[PDB]
Amino acid sequence: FEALGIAQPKGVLLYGPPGTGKTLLARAVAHHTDCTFIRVSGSELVQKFIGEGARMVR
Amino acid sequence: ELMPGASGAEVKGVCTEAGMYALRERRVHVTQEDFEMAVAKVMQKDSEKNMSIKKLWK
Amino acid sequence: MSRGSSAGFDRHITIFSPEGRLYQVEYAFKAINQGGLTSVAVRGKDCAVIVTQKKVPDKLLDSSTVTHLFKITENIGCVMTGMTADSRSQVQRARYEAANWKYKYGYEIPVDMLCKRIADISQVYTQNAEMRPLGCCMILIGIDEEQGPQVYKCDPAGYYCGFKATAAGVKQTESTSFLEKKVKKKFDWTFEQTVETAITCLSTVLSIDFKPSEIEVGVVTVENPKFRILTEAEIDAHLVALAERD
Amino acid sequence: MAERGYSFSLTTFSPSGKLVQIEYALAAVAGGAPSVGIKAANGVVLATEKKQKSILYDERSVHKVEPITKHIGLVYSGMGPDYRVLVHRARKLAQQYYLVYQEPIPTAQLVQRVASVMQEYTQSGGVRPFGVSLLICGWNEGRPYLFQSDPSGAYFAWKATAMGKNYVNGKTFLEKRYNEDLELEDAIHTAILTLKESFEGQMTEDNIEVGICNEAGFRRLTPTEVRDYLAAIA
Amino acid sequence: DQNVNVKVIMATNRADTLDPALLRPGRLDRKIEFPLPDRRQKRLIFSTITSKMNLSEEVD
Amino acid sequence: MAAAAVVEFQRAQSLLSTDREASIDILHSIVKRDIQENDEEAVQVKEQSILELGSLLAKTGQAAELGGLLKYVRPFLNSISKAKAARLVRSLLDLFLDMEAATGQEVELCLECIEWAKSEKRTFLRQALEARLVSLYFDTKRYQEALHLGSQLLRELKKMDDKALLVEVQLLESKTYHALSNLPKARAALTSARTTANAIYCPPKLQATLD
Amino acid sequence: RELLKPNASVALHKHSNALVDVLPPEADSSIMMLTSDQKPDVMYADIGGMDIQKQEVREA
Amino acid sequence: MSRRYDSRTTIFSPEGRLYQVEYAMEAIGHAGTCLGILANDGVLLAAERRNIHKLLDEVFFSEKIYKLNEDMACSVAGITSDANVLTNELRLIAQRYLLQYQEPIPCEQLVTALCDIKQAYTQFGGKRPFGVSLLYIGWDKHYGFQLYQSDPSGNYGGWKATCIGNNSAAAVSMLKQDYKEGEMTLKSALALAVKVLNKTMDVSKLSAEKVEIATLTRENGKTVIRVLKQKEVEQLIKKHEEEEAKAER
């Protein structure tokens, strides 16, 4: 990416309806790379470090 | 061919519903009708939506 | 019932609910319950009887509009049931429409047509919230010219259909089932009986009873098609008979 | 003196090909009375629930089966007051056609004109559109016809459709079932059986009301007759 | 789930009852719907329950 | 209109006037003509033809005329082209089944019927005929056949279904399998039956089996 | 110490510091239960209605 | 109250444009599609009806395409309800202009006049703007064969092949791809029209009941506007099978 130029990925938007197996491909690459795939389903349920968004960034 | 689809939940659900219907019957083969019942009920909800609003859940 | 959800600005407006309810109309039923007026109506073949309670706050009254029996045309007569303020405005509108019918039709109007004109006008109220519907209820009684005696009931909304016998007021449903037993038992329709059966029903549902002076009975007999109020005397004739009747 | 109150749009577009407030009106007709309409192909017969569920009904002319004119009849499901205006308006429209043509208003035409007021009431503030759907019959072009005009103002063309309680389920049963080439007597028998499937509870002759349109003209069947049809079929 | 026991059975009376973590597509294969107004059921409930308690001679 | 107007008079007349052996001869010829008819509505004429022959089915009897006459009901059924019509024919079949004739005749008439319903026209009629054949088979103790007929159909009529008539095959199956002593199969047929049946509204006969 | 590793109740000493024993995951429960006590005013037998629904519950 | 609500109908929003106008475009998206294509000797309209039902009787054979005049035709893209009112206004305007003019009504002239009413409501009167985009096809001498497109926003456009209704972005490109400027004749164009309708629908399978096809072809001295019967459209549905091959090749 340093060679390509453009800043290393900040926002990648995967958009469109589910049932096309969009989540499943993400899991595949995340496992191989050995990055932890941490799923948020729309919830600050899984923010337990203060448990409200906007501090779920920091 | 028959489904219009919409969701991640729905796609797998046809398989689940076919197997469950065979279980309620107490046959250990998956009857030819089971797959038909499962795809029909699910299909019918999804097809309906473009005319008037509805959803698969409350 | 439902109080509705908004997706428009449904809350203070008559426009739709997911029940199909109109907010202003449902509020129109609570206007009935404010007045305290309940009516029992009976159809016969000798006559159509409407009998309803007369409000007394004090004994200094003149009876000309204390009355809830109204002449909506000389042959066919009616009562307004519910809140007396809403009743007077509706009676007023109807009479100008009734007189209009007189210019057009040229004669005594059928009960089916009379209820239909009020129904169309009240469609204007029901669709608007610009002007809230009038939360009175009208039971028209009268002898339709070839068919016979008829009892029709319009709601504040304006829903009308024929019935063997009808009721309006504080609670329609409870009054109707009491009346339904009276209808099953179908009595010989002559003048004394049709008035008396009407009078017994209104007294049973309240369980307060009354004297003849306390109610107002209005009949349209085959005897005189004119719409007539019995008055204190004539009602009394039924009451004394009724006591001897079991 | 003067009235204001509500004059801004009350209706907002929903992505579905219809507005939100009209969609809600279609549920209103569903909780309305059962009414069935089947085109027999030698007349149209329309049947409606007579009752408003008090079960004291004494009909001689107070019907919900109404002749508008010579060969047009209307039976409805939903609101009473909203319907009475459509009946009064329909005669004026039929006659409007009768003056020019010397024939009353075809099914298609009557629908276009009734539909324009129903939409009017939507777009405008301080009004609400009807809660009524119409089963409109007619004999025009040398063929019986049957149209459905919905409370929105949209029209769906139907040879057989059902309204009232279980309307949705009613349309699929008719779509498969619908018949043609039916004798007049048979027309009544099929229509009553379809009414049995929509409408619950007792049927006698003060619970259901039937009207037929054919070549001779629209009229409304006497309570004695309806009873004979009802008994006859399984 | 997939145990000798019944899987967690849930009920909700609102659209705001739920949580998107619970809601997510890829958790619910099954959707159990529930009507209740039908003419048939009414007769059936009445006759079985009437039959549960004692029988009269005015039983209809 | 022809089925009622001449045919019923002519059938009544042959039987009333001249002997039961003599009429059988007239009767064969009248049914052959019936194919063509002289109808002015296929619908009506067919409902009444099937009904008039249906007097013979009820006996049931073992006459020469009985076997041949049975053959006539089958093209007449295909031609009828009305849904309402199926229930009528079902009833006549019920009466053929209640009163026994030979084993072989009864089974074959119903088997042949299932296949023709399928050829000429809809699955809807094919299904209705089926209820009867399966009923009659448990009595005959031809279970093996009953199992094949009922199992096969289920998937095919499933996409069609919004209609009252289809439940009945499911009702009948359960009985035959339960007598057979195959409880899963009986339970399976039961599973299909209550989901499809919805509410009672259906013909008095249909309600009678559902309960 | 091979039946030691699952997540289940266990015992430890305060200050004689030993994992003295292991205990079933059954232990630790303050929840009550009524198997069928204070019996509902319904049963599968005491209704006949909700037939369409009778398949959906039976299975689940 | 009424003073505590928003709907920003006549009132401009933070956007600089009204909510009601923008929302109308969304309703149009999930309703049946209408396209008009140009031919060398006519113009045609092809539309998908708002009926997704499997059984139609054909009481009114105009449920999408209404022929206003003997010189003009329209389609509806949107809600059938707002169309009903608009259809009645169109039978009058189209014939009035003609009484005076004695020349086939110009496609442009009609739309600009109509668009003015669409915008009038949103700006004032406290009414929402119609949920219908009307696709006008006509012929006048001084532009030639025409197609014009109408919006609820009061926007007009001069087109040669365009489509509005459902999945419009795809649809206009698909009409451009098969049909260039002035390329395709009237008969071959009718086929093209059905081919795009088969692909783009609110609900799949294209049938005679779901489609209505209208032709403007200039006959011997008169410009003839006909809506084709179900029977003729069917011959085009087989033609549309042939057309799929032909676009590719």
mmCIF file of C-alpha atoms in Angstrom, chain D residues 20-149:
data_model
loop_
_atom_site.group_PDB
_atom_site.id
_atom_site.type_symbol
_atom_site.label_atom_id
_atom_site.label_comp_id
_atom_site.label_asym_id
_atom_site.label_seq_id
_atom_site.Cartn_x
_atom_site.Cartn_y
_atom_site.Cartn_z
ATOM 1 C CA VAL D 20 -48.191 5.128 4.664
ATOM 2 C CA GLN D 21 -51.641 6.441 5.594
ATOM 3 C CA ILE D 22 -53.388 4.716 2.592
ATOM 4 C CA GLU D 23 -51.741 1.395 3.562
ATOM 5 C CA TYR D 24 -53.405 1.604 6.878
ATOM 6 C CA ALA D 25 -56.819 2.228 5.155
ATOM 7 C CA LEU D 26 -56.495 -1.214 3.399
ATOM 8 C CA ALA D 27 -56.268 -2.855 6.875
ATOM 9 C CA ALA D 28 -59.551 -1.025 7.697
ATOM 10 C CA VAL D 29 -61.409 -2.773 4.819
ATOM 11 C CA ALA D 30 -59.922 -6.052 5.996
ATOM 12 C CA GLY D 31 -61.526 -5.646 9.428
ATOM 13 C CA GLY D 32 -64.602 -4.587 7.384
ATOM 14 C CA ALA D 33 -67.504 -6.852 6.359
ATOM 15 C CA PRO D 34 -67.037 -9.998 4.188
ATOM 16 C CA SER D 35 -68.094 -9.296 0.638
ATOM 17 C CA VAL D 36 -67.425 -11.618 -2.273
ATOM 18 C CA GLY D 37 -67.732 -10.997 -5.971
ATOM 19 C CA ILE D 38 -67.573 -13.504 -8.773
ATOM 20 C CA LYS D 39 -68.142 -12.915 -12.420
ATOM 21 C CA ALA D 40 -70.244 -15.801 -13.753
ATOM 22 C CA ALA D 41 -69.711 -14.799 -17.418
ATOM 23 C CA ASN D 42 -73.414 -14.343 -18.035
ATOM 24 C CA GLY D 43 -73.953 -11.741 -15.474
ATOM 25 C CA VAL D 44 -72.093 -10.774 -12.363
ATOM 26 C CA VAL D 45 -73.183 -11.701 -8.889
ATOM 27 C CA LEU D 46 -72.125 -9.906 -5.802
ATOM 28 C CA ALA D 47 -72.763 -11.012 -2.215
ATOM 29 C CA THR D 48 -72.224 -9.150 0.984
ATOM 30 C CA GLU D 49 -72.503 -9.606 4.737
ATOM 31 C CA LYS D 50 -75.800 -8.154 5.731
ATOM 32 C CA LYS D 51 -75.074 -7.930 9.286
ATOM 33 C CA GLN D 52 -73.121 -5.451 11.393
ATOM 34 C CA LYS D 53 -73.077 -8.244 14.054
ATOM 35 C CA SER D 54 -75.790 -7.188 16.439
ATOM 36 C CA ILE D 55 -77.859 -9.968 14.795
ATOM 37 C CA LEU D 56 -81.071 -8.001 14.738
ATOM 38 C CA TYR D 57 -81.383 -7.379 11.008
ATOM 39 C CA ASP D 58 -84.587 -6.386 9.281
ATOM 40 C CA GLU D 59 -83.814 -5.375 5.714
ATOM 41 C CA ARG D 60 -86.346 -4.362 3.071
ATOM 42 C CA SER D 61 -84.491 -1.584 1.402
ATOM 43 C CA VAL D 62 -81.753 -0.567 3.838
ATOM 44 C CA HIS D 63 -79.352 -2.939 2.056
ATOM 45 C CA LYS D 64 -75.586 -2.840 1.369
ATOM 46 C CA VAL D 65 -76.590 -4.311 -2.053
ATOM 47 C CA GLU D 66 -77.766 -1.200 -3.859
ATOM 48 C CA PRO D 67 -78.664 -0.613 -7.516
ATOM 49 C CA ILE D 68 -76.998 2.551 -8.694
ATOM 50 C CA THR D 69 -78.783 2.343 -12.092
ATOM 51 C CA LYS D 70 -80.109 -0.008 -14.729
ATOM 52 C CA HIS D 71 -77.122 -2.410 -14.745
ATOM 53 C CA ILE D 72 -74.745 -1.273 -12.104
ATOM 54 C CA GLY D 73 -74.830 -2.454 -8.548
ATOM 55 C CA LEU D 74 -72.360 -1.847 -5.680
ATOM 56 C CA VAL D 75 -71.492 -3.925 -2.697
ATOM 57 C CA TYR D 76 -68.718 -2.752 -0.359
ATOM 58 C CA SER D 77 -66.666 -3.576 2.599
ATOM 59 C CA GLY D 78 -65.491 -0.968 5.229
ATOM 60 C CA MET D 79 -67.052 2.285 6.303
ATOM 61 C CA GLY D 80 -70.708 3.245 6.228
ATOM 62 C CA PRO D 81 -70.713 7.091 5.789
ATOM 63 C CA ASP D 82 -67.815 6.927 3.179
ATOM 64 C CA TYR D 83 -69.911 4.438 1.196
ATOM 65 C CA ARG D 84 -73.151 6.489 1.265
ATOM 66 C CA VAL D 85 -71.335 9.389 -0.520
ATOM 67 C CA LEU D 86 -69.933 7.069 -3.161
ATOM 68 C CA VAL D 87 -73.565 5.761 -3.799
ATOM 69 C CA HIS D 88 -74.959 9.277 -4.061
ATOM 70 C CA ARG D 89 -71.993 10.304 -6.253
ATOM 71 C CA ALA D 90 -72.370 7.087 -8.419
ATOM 72 C CA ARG D 91 -75.939 7.785 -9.460
ATOM 73 C CA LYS D 92 -74.842 11.399 -10.462
ATOM 74 C CA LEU D 93 -71.952 9.965 -12.426
ATOM 75 C CA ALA D 94 -74.111 7.211 -14.057
ATOM 76 C CA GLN D 95 -76.601 9.766 -15.149
ATOM 77 C CA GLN D 96 -73.885 12.136 -16.282
ATOM 78 C CA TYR D 97 -73.037 9.270 -18.797
ATOM 79 C CA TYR D 98 -76.799 8.671 -19.288
ATOM 80 C CA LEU D 99 -77.365 12.262 -20.479
ATOM 81 C CA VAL D 100 -74.484 12.258 -23.036
ATOM 82 C CA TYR D 101 -74.501 8.624 -24.264
ATOM 83 C CA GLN D 102 -78.063 7.522 -23.479
ATOM 84 C CA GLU D 103 -76.427 4.553 -21.704
ATOM 85 C CA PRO D 104 -75.054 4.573 -18.171
ATOM 86 C CA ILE D 105 -71.430 4.609 -17.117
ATOM 87 C CA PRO D 106 -69.210 1.615 -18.043
ATOM 88 C CA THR D 107 -67.330 -0.182 -15.197
ATOM 89 C CA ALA D 108 -63.959 1.281 -16.243
ATOM 90 C CA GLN D 109 -65.151 4.819 -16.411
ATOM 91 C CA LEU D 110 -67.015 4.871 -13.148
ATOM 92 C CA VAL D 111 -63.858 3.630 -11.483
ATOM 93 C CA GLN D 112 -61.652 6.354 -12.916
ATOM 94 C CA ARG D 113 -63.942 9.089 -11.579
ATOM 95 C CA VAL D 114 -64.575 7.611 -8.108
ATOM 96 C CA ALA D 115 -60.839 6.950 -7.751
ATOM 97 C CA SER D 116 -59.905 10.694 -8.302
ATOM 98 C CA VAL D 117 -61.815 11.826 -5.138
ATOM 99 C CA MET D 118 -60.389 9.035 -3.038
ATOM 100 C CA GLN D 119 -56.789 10.190 -3.917
ATOM 101 C CA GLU D 120 -57.871 13.863 -3.417
ATOM 102 C CA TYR D 121 -58.526 13.229 0.249
ATOM 103 C CA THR D 122 -55.070 11.722 0.634
ATOM 104 C CA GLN D 123 -52.839 14.456 -0.750
ATOM 105 C CA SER D 124 -54.809 17.307 0.880
ATOM 106 C CA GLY D 125 -54.383 18.234 4.510
ATOM 107 C CA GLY D 126 -57.389 18.148 6.954
ATOM 108 C CA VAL D 127 -58.997 15.233 5.133
ATOM 109 C CA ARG D 128 -58.559 11.496 5.103
ATOM 110 C CA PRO D 129 -59.263 9.213 2.126
ATOM 111 C CA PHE D 130 -62.139 6.704 2.203
ATOM 112 C CA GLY D 131 -62.032 3.512 4.151
ATOM 113 C CA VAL D 132 -64.090 1.858 1.435
ATOM 114 C CA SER D 133 -63.359 -0.642 -1.268
ATOM 115 C CA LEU D 134 -65.929 -1.322 -4.001
ATOM 116 C CA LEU D 135 -67.020 -4.399 -5.886
ATOM 117 C CA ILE D 136 -68.420 -2.853 -8.984
ATOM 118 C CA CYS D 137 -70.369 -4.788 -11.525
ATOM 119 C CA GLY D 138 -71.694 -3.928 -14.838
ATOM 120 C CA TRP D 139 -72.659 -5.292 -18.266
ATOM 121 C CA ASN D 140 -70.806 -3.310 -20.970
ATOM 122 C CA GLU D 141 -69.349 -4.187 -24.258
ATOM 123 C CA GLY D 142 -71.591 -7.344 -24.351
ATOM 124 C CA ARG D 143 -69.596 -8.952 -21.534
ATOM 125 C CA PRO D 144 -70.100 -8.882 -17.653
ATOM 126 C CA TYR D 145 -67.294 -7.186 -15.810
ATOM 127 C CA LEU D 146 -66.082 -6.834 -12.261
ATOM 128 C CA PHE D 147 -63.655 -4.295 -10.934
ATOM 129 C CA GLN D 148 -62.011 -3.629 -7.593
ATOM 130 C CA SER D 149 -61.406 -0.107 -6.447
#
